[PDB]
Design a protein around this nucleic acid. Structure first.
Ligand code: MG
Length: 905
DNA sequence: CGTCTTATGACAGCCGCG
DNA sequence: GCGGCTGTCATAA
């Protein structure tokens, strides 16, 4: 009923807009938008417009956008500030939609497609589009259909029609295993020549023009190829037809290495899912191929084919088309799980930006703050250029490398946004400065009180207490939204453990899963039904609860990063509200806050245990403290606990009823000390970690900063059915560590924390024996391939050449001259294996594209010359040496006087 | 989109050192 | 041979 935009675009003096109207139909505008900009004026000229500092401004209405834009630059030639929203697209959206936008996703045309191109030359470069497009699968969210465009005849072979009957059948019948739930949604259309296929695709494109266009590498491959191929056959004008406003532009992306070209389609928002994944998944992956991510996300994988992909359409055209359809579907399957598109939509409409601007936190916040200031008749300052300057960040405590038996951790909730709100940090709320004492003096409360009238930060900054800042006001809206979605997420997590516990002792019956909302804790009535439920329907409930959890994670993690990005933007020279005073004010307050409460926790627990000077806090990073619970348990005596859950319950109550109130009054005192606007430093308990009761097992260990492992029984309110390992920083968490090595090192840790030294020594022995029999990919290292050309000296390694780069140059020599094997792509990742000396390849290592097997033309030699000893030492033994040294254990039993006896019975 | 931030670790190349 | 130094790549916040 209320109308909303789809895409907005500026072309010359006109604004081009696609939108849904009051009746719910998609329409297009061409508006000659008249933009306003502002200039400072004297006190006499009474207006309603004021800048953020309170100074008056006069309004300048322009005849067109060209006039407004060129008024800005000649204001600089005089040397005067040109105020207001210079991005006229954002100005238009704000005027046209001066209310909270409530959109309808069912009316937004979201499309994802993928292309197939047969190429014997090697990789088909989008910039050249030298080879025919032989397949296109295009999914439309409004129709809910997969549109398949098949080429029967090309210079690379004539093929028969694709059979949907064969596609549906299982591999064991000679079928393709195309998921049954999409079979009835496939609209198939074969073509005699490329020109007919490409011409009908454009007609289809006009009839159903995408608003959000997505897919896997659509921006870097699919879109450019379809654009350039149409251009080369039909002409530039016909290629422009992919744009609703017939306007396209080649955009050049250049970073600290090389450059690449993409194609901007005006009037369409392109959200490449590979980029949504990298931004919002919070995972670093060894490979970013669709087959690899699909396997990680959905535990599926694809049916394997014989021969190279360049010969696939020839040998097996049936599978060729089927795989293309499947690939278009898995993006949708990943989105069903992660929900990054819905996230992007909610975010973009809230900020009132082009949907693709979700990739730019600076644009996002610049729009949010502008809209907030516009409501109050206030005028935003001009964007000014600044030199890049370093500034201090968080505090990280230097831990003593040791094992730690009983550990309990605490985190500050939304630290940086909370500091902003507590101290009232904002551009227009700066009051002044005070003489700053050493940071240590504020921590112990020995320094004099900074101000009696203003809200202070230990970096020397003072802020107004009565005035509410734009930044604190707009951040408040976001943090309360995170509290809700994290609440849903944690309840889904808690509900998951109840079900996991029910899978241990199930009841074999024929029933269905219970219809419940997993975002809320199960009631007693639902719990008793779960106990009498079948393992089949329990596994379905578990799948659904975890899927609800993942949906909760996505939402809360995105709000987390967007809020932290506001702090981050303050330290970025391009942000309209760039201010290192405000940036440092935040980080210095945090530094004091962490170290302050460390002192308080140490004081409290010493009084509680009847001792003095004992160091209870062992570690901290930014907003967290890790407390040694050894003494707390010892004061009671661990003989008084009947099982593991007993002492976990005890520390839980100790934290909630004793430590947290003591923490609250500590921070409350600090609030008075800094004279802050409001007390918002709240600390929740996170981990309760320790060994199983009665077992050998070290519970946890630290090796250094950002590197530790814990055996966690309870995390932030969720009581695990089985203890989960919390490992931070260690090699098991790095995408560069081989897959099999990660798994082995994790088991090493698990045995250390839960079972003890003798168990570790046992597993080491067995892994060391069966090491050589592991899949070569699973034991291969991963690294990013940057600056290959920089170290390439006539095919051979130059000075200071990194290990993985040495591998690539070896690979390139091995595949040199032969028509085309898989090529290593600049900027992407590679597998790395060490080679034994004397190998037919030039060097001590080899590298090839990750997520793939090496060429069969070189595979057997690599396997034969693999250096297993160097690989075991570098990737497995050396890291395990690190863990065991820290924990004061041996992974290998040291020589003893006992060796001079015979213990074999 | 290509204009969120700092802190901090491991590891390999190069090179000194009778 | 190992330790200092720097480049590179990765993570924790
Ligand atoms: Mg494809």
């Amino acid at each position: 009923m209320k109308e909303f935009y789809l895409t907005v675009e500026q072309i010359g003096d006109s604004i081009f807009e696609r939108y849904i109207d009051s009746n719910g139909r998609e329409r297009t505008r061409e508006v000659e938008y008249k933009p306003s900009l502002f200039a400072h004026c004297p006190e006499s000229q009474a207006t309603k417009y004021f800048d953020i500092y309170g100074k008056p401004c006069t309004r300048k209405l322009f005849a067109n956008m060209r006039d407004a834009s060129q008024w800005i630059k000649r204001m600089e030639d005089i040397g005067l500030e040109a105020l207001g929203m210079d991005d006229f697209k954002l100005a238009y959206l704000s005027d046209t939609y001066n209310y909270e936008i409530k959109y309808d996703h069912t009316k937004i045309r979201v499309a994802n497609f993928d292309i197939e191109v047969t190429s014997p030359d090697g990789f088909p470069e989008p910039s050249q589009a030298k080879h025919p497009i032989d397949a296109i699968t295009h999914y439309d969210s409004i129709d809910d259909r997969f549109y398949v465009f098949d080429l029967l005849n090309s210079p690379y072979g004539n093929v028969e029609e694709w059979s949907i009957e064969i596609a549906a059948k299982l591999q064991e019948q000679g079928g393709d295993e195309v998921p049954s739930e999409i079979i009835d949604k496939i609209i198939y259309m074969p073509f005699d020549n490329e020109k007919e296929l490409l011409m009908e695709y454009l007609n289809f494109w006009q009839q159903k023009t995408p608003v959000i266009l997505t897919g896997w590498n659509v921006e870097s491959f699919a879109i450019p190829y379809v654009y350039n191929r149409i251009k080369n056959i039909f002409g530039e004008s016909t290629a422009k037809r992919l744009s609703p406003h017939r306007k396209t532009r080649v955009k050049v992306i250049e970073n600290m290495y090389g450059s690449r070209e993409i194609i901007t389609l005006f009037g369409i928002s392109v959200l490449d899912y590979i980029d949504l994944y990298k931004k919002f998944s919070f995972t670093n992956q060894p490979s970013y191929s669709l087959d690899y991510i699909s396997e990680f996300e959905l535990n599926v994988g694809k049916l394997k084919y014989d021969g190279p992909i360049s010969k696939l359409r020839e040998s097996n055209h049936q599978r060729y088309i089927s795989y293309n359809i499947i690939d278009v579907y898995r993006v949708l399957q990943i989105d069903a799980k992660r929900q990054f598109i819905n996230l992007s939509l909610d975010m973009g409409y809230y900020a009132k930006i082009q949907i693709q601007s979700v990739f730019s936190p600076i644009k996002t916040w610049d729009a949010i703050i502008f809209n907030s200031l516009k409501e109050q008749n206030k005028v935003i300052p001009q964007g000014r250029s600044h030199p890049v300057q370093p500034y201090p960040g968080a505090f990280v405590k230097e831990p003593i490398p040791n094992r730690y038996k009983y550990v309990m951790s605490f985190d500050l909730t939304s630290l940086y946004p909370s500091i902003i709100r507590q101290v009232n940090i904002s551009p227009e709320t700066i009051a002044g400065t005070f003489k700053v004492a050493p940071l240590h003096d504020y921590i112990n409360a020995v320094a004099e009180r900074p101000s009696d009238v203003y809200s202070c930060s230990p970096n020397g900054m003072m802020y107004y207490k009565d005035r509410d800042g734009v930044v604190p006001t707009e951040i408040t809206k976001w943090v309360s939204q995170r509290k809700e979605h994290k609440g849903y997420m944690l309840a889904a997590q808690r509900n998951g453990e109840i079900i996991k516990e029910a899978l241990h002792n199930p009841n074999l019956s024929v029933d269905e899963p219970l219809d419940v909302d997993y975002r809320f804790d199960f009631s007693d009535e639902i719990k008793e039904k779960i106990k009498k439920l079948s393992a089949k329907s329990l596994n379905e409930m578990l799948f659904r609860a975890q899927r609800t959890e993942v949906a909760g994670m996505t939402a809360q993690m995105a709000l987390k990063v967007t809020c932290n990005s506001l702090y981050g933007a303050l330290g970025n020279v391009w942000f309209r509200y760039y201010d290192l005073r405000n940036a440092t004010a935040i980080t210095t307050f945090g530094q004091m806050a962490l170290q302050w409460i460390e002192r308080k926790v140490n004081e409290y627990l010493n009084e509680v245990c009847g001792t003095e000077g004992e160091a209870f806090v062992l570690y901290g990073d930014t907003d967290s403290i890790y407390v040694s619970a050894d003494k707390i348990i010892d004061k009671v005596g661990e003989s008084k606990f009947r099982d593991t859950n007993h002492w976990v319950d005890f520390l839980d109550k100790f934290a909630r009823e004793r430590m947290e109130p003591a923490i609250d009054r500590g921070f409350r005192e600090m609030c008075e000390y800094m004279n802050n606007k409001q007390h918002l430093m709240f600390m929740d308990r996170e981990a309760i970690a320790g060994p199983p009761l009665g077992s050998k097992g070290i519970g946890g260990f630290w090796t250094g900063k950002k590197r530790y492992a814990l055996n966690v029984w309870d995390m932030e309110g969720t009581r695990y059915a089985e203890p989960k390992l919390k490992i931070m920083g260690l090699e098991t968490q790095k995408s560069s560590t081989p897959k099999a090595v990660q798994k082995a090192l994790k088991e090493c840790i698990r045995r250390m924390l839960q079972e003890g030294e003798e168990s570790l020594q046992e597993y080491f022995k067995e892994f060391e024996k069966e090491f050589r029999q592991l899949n070569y990919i699973s034991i291969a290292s991963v690294s990013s391939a940057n600056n290959i050309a920089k170290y390439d000296v006539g095919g051979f390694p130059g000075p200071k050449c990194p290990f993985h780069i040495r591998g690539i140059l070896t690979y390139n020599r091995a595949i040199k001259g032969n028509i085309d094997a898989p090529q290593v792509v600049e900027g992407e990742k590679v597998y790395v294996l060490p080679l034994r000396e004397g190998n037919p390849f030039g060097d001590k290592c080899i590298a090839w594209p990750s997520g793939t097997e090496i060429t069969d033309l070189i595979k057997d030699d690599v396997l034969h010359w693999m250096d297993y000893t160097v690989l075991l030492e570098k990737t497995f033994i050396k890291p395990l040496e690190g863990f065991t040294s820290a924990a004061k254990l041996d992974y290998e039993k040291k020589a003893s006087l006992f060796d001079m006896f015979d213990f074999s019975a």
